[PDB]
Design a protein around this ligand. Sequence first.
Ligand SMILES: NC(=O)C1=CN([C@@H]2O[C@H](COP(=O)(O)OP(=O)(O)OC[C@H]3O[C@@H](n4cnc5c(N)ncnc54)[C@H](OP(=O)(O)O)[C@@H]3O)[C@@H](O)[C@H]2O)C=CC1
Ligand SMILES: NC(=O)C1=CN([C@@H]2O[C@H](COP(=O)(O)OP(=O)(O)OC[C@H]3O[C@@H](n4cnc5c(N)ncnc54)[C@H](OP(=O)(O)O)[C@@H]3O)[C@@H](O)[C@H]2O)C=CC1
Ligand SMILES: NC(=O)C1=CN([C@@H]2O[C@H](COP(=O)(O)OP(=O)(O)OC[C@H]3O[C@@H](n4cnc5c(N)ncnc54)[C@H](OP(=O)(O)O)[C@@H]3O)[C@@H](O)[C@H]2O)C=CC1
Ligand SMILES: NC(=O)c1ccc[n+]([C@@H]2O[C@H](COP(=O)([O-])OP(=O)(O)OC[C@H]3O[C@@H](n4cnc5c(N)ncnc54)[C@H](OP(=O)(O)O)[C@@H]3O)[C@@H](O)[C@H]2O)c1
Ligand SMILES: Fc1ccc(F)c(C2=NCCC2)c1
Ligand SMILES: Fc1ccc(F)c(C2=NCCC2)c1
Ligand SMILES: Fc1ccc(F)c(C2=NCCC2)c1
Ligand SMILES: Fc1ccc(F)c(C2=NCCC2)c1
Lengths: 286, 285, 287, 287
Amino acid sequence: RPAPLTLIGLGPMGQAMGNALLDRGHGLTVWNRTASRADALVERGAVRAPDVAAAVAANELVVLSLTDYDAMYALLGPAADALAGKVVVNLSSDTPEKTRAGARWIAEHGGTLIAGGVTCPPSGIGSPESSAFYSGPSAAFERHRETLRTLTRTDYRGEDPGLAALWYQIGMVMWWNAMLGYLQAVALADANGLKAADILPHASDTVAGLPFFLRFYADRIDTGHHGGDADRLAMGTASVEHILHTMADSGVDTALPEAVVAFFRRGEAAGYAENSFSSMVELLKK
Amino acid sequence: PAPLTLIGLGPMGQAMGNALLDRGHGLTVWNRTASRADALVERGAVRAPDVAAAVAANELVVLSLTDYDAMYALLGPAADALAGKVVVNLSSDTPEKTRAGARWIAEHGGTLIAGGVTCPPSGIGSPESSAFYSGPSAAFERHRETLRTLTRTDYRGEDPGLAALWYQIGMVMWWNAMLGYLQAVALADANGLKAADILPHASDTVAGLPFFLRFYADRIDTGHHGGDADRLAMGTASVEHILHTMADSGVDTALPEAVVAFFRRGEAAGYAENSFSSMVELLKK
Amino acid sequence: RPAPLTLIGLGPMGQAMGNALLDRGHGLTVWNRTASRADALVERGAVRAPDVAAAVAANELVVLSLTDYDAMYALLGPAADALAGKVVVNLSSDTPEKTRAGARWIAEHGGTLIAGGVTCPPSGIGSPESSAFYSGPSAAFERHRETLRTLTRTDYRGEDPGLAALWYQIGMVMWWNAMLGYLQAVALADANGLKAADILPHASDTVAGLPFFLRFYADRIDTGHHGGDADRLAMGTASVEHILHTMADSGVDTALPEAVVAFFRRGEAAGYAENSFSSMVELLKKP
Amino acid sequence: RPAPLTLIGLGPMGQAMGNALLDRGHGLTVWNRTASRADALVERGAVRAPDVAAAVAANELVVLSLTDYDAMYALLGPAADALAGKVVVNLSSDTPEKTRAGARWIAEHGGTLIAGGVTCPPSGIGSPESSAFYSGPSAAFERHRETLRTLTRTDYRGEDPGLAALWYQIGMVMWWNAMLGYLQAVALADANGLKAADILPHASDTVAGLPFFLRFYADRIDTGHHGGDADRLAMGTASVEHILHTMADSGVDTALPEAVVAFFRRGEAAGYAENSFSSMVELLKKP
Ligand SMILES: NC(=O)C1=CN([C@@H]2O[C@H](COP(=O)(O)OP(=O)(O)OC[C@H]3O[C@@H](n4cnc5c(N)ncnc54)[C@H](OP(=O)(O)O)[C@@H]3O)[C@@H](O)[C@H]2O)C=CC1
Ligand SMILES: NC(=O)C1=CN([C@@H]2O[C@H](COP(=O)(O)OP(=O)(O)OC[C@H]3O[C@@H](n4cnc5c(N)ncnc54)[C@H](OP(=O)(O)O)[C@@H]3O)[C@@H](O)[C@H]2O)C=CC1
Ligand SMILES: NC(=O)C1=CN([C@@H]2O[C@H](COP(=O)(O)OP(=O)(O)OC[C@H]3O[C@@H](n4cnc5c(N)ncnc54)[C@H](OP(=O)(O)O)[C@@H]3O)[C@@H](O)[C@H]2O)C=CC1
Ligand SMILES: NC(=O)c1ccc[n+]([C@@H]2O[C@H](COP(=O)([O-])OP(=O)(O)OC[C@H]3O[C@@H](n4cnc5c(N)ncnc54)[C@H](OP(=O)(O)O)[C@@H]3O)[C@@H](O)[C@H]2O)c1
Ligand SMILES: Fc1ccc(F)c(C2=NCCC2)c1
Ligand SMILES: Fc1ccc(F)c(C2=NCCC2)c1
Ligand SMILES: Fc1ccc(F)c(C2=NCCC2)c1
Ligand SMILES: Fc1ccc(F)c(C2=NCCC2)c1
């Protein structure tokens, strides 16, 4: 049942990915720019391909966990011709356009690229609650969907490889902003005698109440309802200025809070003070 | 339920007034835009003619204003009658300006209890909602049960600025994620997707955040910035991917650019092989 | 596009699921033994199927909100043959074993059962603040995940159909116990002149401090560390005995507090009095 | 200046009490039966009285952190002739009647007992978010309220010492039951390959969703609205029966789920099957 596969890219994610596959009983062949990284997996039952050309040729499925799509060209460029009949599932982050450019390159060499965006940390590889967006030619994705179901759940977003990257970037823009806000909160807390452990209960309660506002503002934004019934930008403009000045009074970097105040200053200049802060989506759109 | 005066009838004060009447509190209500008091007045609320009478009607005066500067503008005319009053200011501000309002209320013979409501107006009334309180314990304890009608009470200490600090610690994370939601909806609008099409993923992503908050918590507390799970260099690429995805789709790039620049400052600080958590040191400045 | 689906089981949960699905623009075919319960959803724009067979026939996705899995055998029983090609999402509570058996029943009739456990009340259907456990054939779940996301978030726990039920019963043993304790708190308060409103703030402060104790005792239980550093069982056996006698002295039924006292005394009898109350997990690990 | 005081009872809670009193600057005289427990506080500056009598006579304010009120009689009984003019703040859990019995015994010996229910773990002593119910002589409590604020917030519930104990037991019937539910969930999990750390997110999510039901059912119990618009006791009896059989099938102890099942079966027999489980608040008024 568990089909063989080549995994190139053995960082935090691909290492855990190879673990989850060998665990299920898959035929793992691992290659990496840093060949030292392919050693614990190789000791657990994986074959070190001596070259990327041999890696690409060992199996039909080539899974990629690299920092970006440029890393793919740099690793598979030496073996470009060996990509014929091969299916490259790139679980690497990049722009939809750069994701499609990768697909085109694999396509010039007789292979098909399936894009992928894992929405889980390395600890989540092998966990059923973990999911990944996938996009690109259906047949190639479908004939490997079950080996990919070993890593995460499969959410097909379309035939355009760019869609999986677009959906990953949609969730990551919220993830990174919230996590930079955590780092900002931890820094304000350290400047005030507190630890991340002291502010963790509140932080978690704060981010878990977020889905309410996500729903509250979804339909309202999709209809142009930016009424000040639950909030006025003017009140929130004061709120973000309070974060900036509280941070400044406590000696904490003000670059990120000053950039947030600037966005609210643009909303005030657009006449949105009596409207919901949601109105500022019209400054981000188009 | 003990009687009280509530000044500040915007989105939250309106909800607070509805909740105080719902428990049974006799309410004296005043607002600069007196038009915003009509509904609560018909529900049974006495419309104080002026702020002076509002303050004199009850010991407890709860303020729901945009900032602490609004209290000076509203209570300042009748600051003489603030003597013997407990002012529960539920208005956001910096700890230092919250402390200034405490001194101001105290110079007028009163006591300020600082408050930061960590709930929307729709949550006023539910013990699922919480608010930070700070300032003289005695005055807090005296009026804690009237405050429990609006929200649960989370006392953060006798320094009135403490509730404001705790509120700002949550709101930096709250506003950042909500601004990110606005960026996701614009990226989606530019790609034929509505917010309702992206709301599930957005809600799944923000709901998984508590795990990542705990994972990096004790690590940051102990100084562990290992790239065992994440390298700042891959995150710099990830946030740059966000920037160019936004730029390629025609969406505003101001906020993605500030994040890219923050990660590049971290790479310049030598934390490329370390976890993105390492940039907490550049924020401690 | 909002995919069409059939909803059988229009109790408090099923009525709310119908309203949420209609709110997203889903084409809903509905059926309930009591047809008056389908009236409002029909007037909103739902199709009132006359038979249970016709409801199952109308759409591939059949969502069940029934009391138990025995109720699926009763309702879908007549037209079991016509369950072929259909994906039955069973959001009914039951034992992992009974849930697994329902999957085999749906499968022996040509269908696929996705098991589901809604961790929200009816007021939470439609909210992305709400979540539901799902388990069963991965392909069917992925094909219908988006229509189910209209009701709650999706927490897939695996291919074993009994896994959603297990995870649901794990949350429900804590849920029911905390809520039966709230009822006992309300009854002790009434017996002492206090209304539920008077005890609600303290009750909500008590349950909001719980996540701290769940974490505190998690690593300790998983590591076998049941030391009396923060609590000794004998101090807790006294505390549960205080609740019991406080309730007996107040004329409140003592059946539920006698059971808790009996459980703490079992730990004392097994030698765990100087150990944490957490040690009593070792008495539960066996039947 | 932080007023001086005597602390007797240096277990998990008392040690944390002494640490917080010393942290603020209180002249602390400590005494514990197991002397080793004062050792660290004495190096921090705690006096260490030679015996219990010397401790009671050192200060007007004597704080007790013992397992129960029977422990007070056995410790303060040999030093009973020294209790006159002394304010004994007893932070020990016990029933309202036994707390009033301690108040009477203290007053027969010339002193005044103030009852206290600390609704904070030892980790929360010294924390401003922490609270304690207090009941007993108002003036004596008011004279010593500032020193008691060092440990926790002070919520005076009245002149009867039984009021604090009652308020403490009202919260602890809910707390203990939710913790026994957590222990049951961890056992169900262990029998199914899952650790407490694996179920901790769902457990924490389940218990943070409780404050909604507390308010929802508080408003309805107070108004006699035990309608089944959001639930039926019959659907709940099935749910609790599923917890019992899920635990039995997994070889997990059934004594506790059997008692919940028995109470739900008592409600269906009382004619409440079509009503909310909240109707069982009435079964709790008739033993
Ligand atoms: N959901 C929410 O709105 C939340 C807000 N908060 C905080 O609660 C507070 C109230 O916010 P919100 O309910 O939106 O109300 P607003 O901030 O929109 O306004 C609150 C009240 O303050 C009055 N006010 C504003 N400026 C002045 C001034 N210069 N002088 C006198 N009165 C003034 C308004 O007057 P008028 O109506 O007469 O024009 C209104 O009655 C804020 O500090 C906010 O940060 C906390 C949590 C969530
Ligand atoms: N109630 C809640 O808050 C929550 C409950 N759940 C779960 O959701 C499920 C649905 O329960 P809920 O809708 O709340 O309430 P009910 O259990 O009362 O509703 C279930 C349905 O069963 C139907 N039914 C009655 N008799 C039979 C029968 N003989 N054969 C088949 N079906 C029958 C009822 O129809 P009729 O109108 O004719 O009686 C009703 O539509 C349960 O399994 C429960 O554990 C989980 C989340 C929250
Ligand atoms: N998390 C918690 O533990 C909380 C507990 N409480 C309540 O606070 C009280 C104390 O808590 P905790 O410290 O855990 O309790 P313990 O029972 O673990 O210890 C309390 C102290 O009582 C002393 N003691 C008991 N009997 C006698 C006696 N006959 N003579 C002299 N000393 C005696 C013990 O002295 P020795 O060292 O010699 O045994 C010990 O120091 C209890 O009533 C408890 O219900 C409330 C809030 C939280
Ligand atoms: N880490 C997470 O938590 C997480 C979760 C989901 C998504 N992701 C995405 O998953 C991908 C992998 O992230 P990661 O943290 O596991 O790993 P990473 O730190 O991005 O490194 C992954 C791999 O990329 C290789 N690589 C990087 N640049 C290269 C180049 N120019 N040429 C050749 N190889 C190159 C590295 O090779 P060496 O071994 O030689 O260094 C390494 O094996 C990223 O695209 C990321 O956005 C991250
Ligand atoms: F949940 C997710 C999803 C995608 C991710 F890249 C992450 C990361 N964790 C550490 C850095 C990226 C977490
Ligand atoms: F829209 C707004 C504006 C300001 C706010 F503080 C909020 C909040 N909701 C709960 C956290 C604060 C929402
Ligand atoms: F949040 C939840 C989850 C599952 C449930 F069964 C409930 C219930 N509410 C009333 C009884 C069962 C609530
Ligand atoms: F482990 C225990 C034992 C007895 C207790 F009272 C407590 C707590 N009380 C307030 C919350 C924790 C914890």
